[PDB]
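In the previous chapter we treated chains in isolation. Here, by contrast, the input contains five separate entities that must be folded as one system, with a combined length of 474 residues.
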Amino acid sequence: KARERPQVELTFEETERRALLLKKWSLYKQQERKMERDTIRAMLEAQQEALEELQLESPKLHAEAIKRDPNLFPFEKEGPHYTPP
Amino acid sequence: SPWRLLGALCLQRPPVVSKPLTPLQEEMASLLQQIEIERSLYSDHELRALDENQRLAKKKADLAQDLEDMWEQKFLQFKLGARITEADEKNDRTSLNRKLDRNLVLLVREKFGDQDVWILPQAEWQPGETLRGTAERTLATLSENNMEAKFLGNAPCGHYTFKFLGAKVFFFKALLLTGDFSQAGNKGHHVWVTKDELGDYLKPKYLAQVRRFVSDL
Amino acid sequence: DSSRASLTRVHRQAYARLYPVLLVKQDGSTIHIRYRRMLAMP
Amino acid sequence: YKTKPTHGIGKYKHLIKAEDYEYGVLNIHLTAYDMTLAESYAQYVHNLCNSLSIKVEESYAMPTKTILTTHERVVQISGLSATFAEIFLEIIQSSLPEGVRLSVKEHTEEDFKGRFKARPELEELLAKLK
RNA sequence: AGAGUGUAGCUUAACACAAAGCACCCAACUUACACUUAGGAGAUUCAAUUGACGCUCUGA
């Protein structure tokens, strides 16, 4: 049921605080996503320029350089711990 | 002109600990915690605590607080690992446990015949030997350890052509899973670099852009 | 940016209150988990 | 009209299809004991691959496993170039919140599920097989 | 050191009454996505067509 805390009454200054927090959060997340977009674009263009230079230097290497590898299929990543073991 | 056949490996270690929070994050964390408290429905612990305490009080007139108390005490009893292990050395570049919240890379100081500069680990690739194979060869030979590295992709993360006989260097990314390093104080000048140290160490303009193909994270 | 993505609001309307408990089985590596203060398994 | 130059001006369903080394369907598995974190990262990986113009088959859920129950969420990912896939997996490993597992086991022929097709789809399929 | 130059991501948008239109992010619904609703952040590199601050390629 919902008899635990049926009453939910808060002040006005807290609403103002909440609004400011949400506005700041929106700005922050926009900035963070901008950083992500910048880094991925930089990485992609780095890949492109390296590959193009490889084409010019050696016509042989790119064939194996674009080739898939089976070992990637069963990949596992270890998540970060709040304390070292 | 014949080209100097060189392949470079870039090794990255995942952060052991999460990055420290911003004031904004923590205040919003408190805000969502408040929201969670507000919008909960019929929590069993609160029924076991508050209402039971009231009933027992009425009965006595004619406990879960203590439970929380000894829970907290035994929580305090159990020692937790220090997040700040960094503070002990603050000067050691040869330590895997230098930084826990950041991504770190190996950098080797070698005295080349024509140049005296920091150089990321290299391999001489023969026509027979693949770039991948030489990457594992780099991991095995000049490291002198039991590093296990996962090779992400054969695609070159970076490439630079530097001239004083053409010279070419190709950088590939590898991810460290599990490894034990013996003889830390070896002849090899190995340095763990987070993000900032590579800029200072790599004085040439060509190498200065290593940061372009490595995530700051 | 682990902590950046760690922040999340609850989407489920019908749920019981959860507490940020710390999980230390035997490894010693603590984890913040929303759960109904220590975790142990034989 | 056929003779007129304005013939086939109202052709519409040539534009819609109501039916290079490419990886198989990556079923990315995210497990955490905290349901909230798993759901969050599922949403994150979804909108990320959406922004990177990567095809998604399904983001379905499977029943919870009893142990302190562990929560699991899967997303189906396809349309990855090798060089692009490299960047993709490094992104998804970097921004991992707290101890959520990443199983990137690919879809196999034996583990195949056929969806309940709609009336137009079945009619189209019948027309083709006729 | 030379050349090419120049509006938030994009646009031979900007005669003017004007720095505009898509992109982008957060919150609600959605397991999700998407739609919708409710909010947020944005720029003419500086001085008089010209000169010098940022960017890309060529020298060691």
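Chain A is about 60% helix and 0% strand. Chain A touches chain D at residues 36, 40, 43-44, 47, 51, 66-68, 72-77, 79-82 (CB under 8 Å). Compare these points with the single-chain example from earlier in the chapter.
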